[PDB]
Design a protein around this ligand. Structure first.
Ligand code: 8O0
Ligand code: DST
Length: 291
């Protein structure tokens, strides 16, 4: 079956990258969501957030107007009340902005970590009405204006990290210059990467900005780029990129990949790479950003 091949592949990725994982967690996740993994946008992700440690996430998305993952996770025990503003945030999101899709994200050592809300691209003003957003979001209106973060293409609630992301379509001509990325990164006193990475960033069609309830500032920013096959991933930039690009499983032989470049302060400066397991994610990425 597809679901058994997926579960096998996930375990094999975790063992190959030495990622911490829990067989009991994986059993819970697949009990609730394995059927969903078989026939929707499904990806396996690895990242090097923590020092000398690779983490493995699995995630899916589908074009439903309601947030089915929330009901499944509540019923299957994968999401309990946190005693925290995240408890109702996703509900508020789907009440405040109409969704064309939703998604969910799982750390295979923990369980459900995030749920995504995917609207049609809307002005970012539509998010300022969401009551339980961290106050730092409204406090950053002038920042969003200045860096042409006006076109909101997704929202996410990170239940484990207790944080939220806003995702923007990087449509503005200024975002085709390396100076834009140097300036938005320096504005947060984040690390500025090499010129190589900068000329990769200028092609990023999407920018994520992370907020939380523990600071007035931005926690980290992420620039996302897709690659149509293993060969065009910039494997030389980092060993995790090379190893995952050459080894990641998929249902076709040469799958595409989504690469996120994260930047923070002792920070979240790191790489994320996801494999387009079924082949739907990468085209939907280009389509949602009109490329
Ligand atoms: C299918 N789908 C999902 C989609 C998604 C959820 N949140 C997003 C925020 C920005 C962009 C995207 C998403 C897409 C459309 C590029 C997409 C990515 C893949 Cl990796 C995911 C997570 C499924 C495994
Ligand atoms: C397009 C990408 C692959 C999904 C967007 S959500 P994310 O996984 O990048 O969010 P975080 O890394 O948890 O901040």
């Amino acid at each position: 079956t597809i679901v058994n091949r997926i579960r096998t592949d996930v375990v094999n990725v975790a063992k190959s990258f030495g990622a911490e994982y829990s067989e009991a967690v994986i059993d819970q996740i697949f009990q609730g969501f394995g059927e969903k993994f078989t026939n929707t946008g499904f990806a396996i992700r690895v990242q090097n957030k923590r020092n000398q440690k690779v983490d493995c996430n699995i995630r899916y998305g589908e074009a439903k107007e309601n947030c089915l993952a929330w009901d499944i996770a509540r019923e299957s025990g994968l999401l309990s009340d946190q005693g925290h503003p995240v408890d109702t945030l996703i509900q508020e999101m789907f009440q405040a902005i109409p969704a064309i899709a939703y998604g969910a994200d799982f750390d295979i050592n923990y369980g459900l970590v995030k749920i995504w809300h995917l609207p049609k691209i809307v002005p970012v003003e539509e998010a300022f009405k969401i009551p339980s957003l961290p106050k730092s979001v409204n406090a950053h209106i002038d920042f969003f204006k200045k860096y042409h973060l006006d076109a909101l293409c997704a929202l996410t609630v990170d239940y484990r990290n207790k944080s939220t992301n806003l995702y923007f379509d990087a449509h503005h001509p200024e975002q085709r210059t390396t100076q834009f990325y140097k300036n938005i990164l320096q504005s947060q006193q984040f690390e500025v990467p090499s010129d190589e990475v900068l000329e990769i960033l200028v092609n990023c069609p999407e920018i994520a900005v992370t907020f939380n309830w523990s600071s007035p500032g931005i926690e980290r920013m992420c620039f996302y780029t897709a690659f149509v096959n293993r060969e065009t991933v910039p494997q030389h930039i980092n060993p995790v990129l090379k190893k995952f690009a050459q080894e990641a499983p998929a249902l076709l032989d040469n799958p595409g990949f989504l690469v996120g470049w994260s930047f923070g302060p002792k920070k979240g400066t790191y790489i994320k790479i996801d494999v387009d397991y079924h082949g739907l994610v990468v085209p939907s990425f280009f389509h949602m950003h009109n490329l």
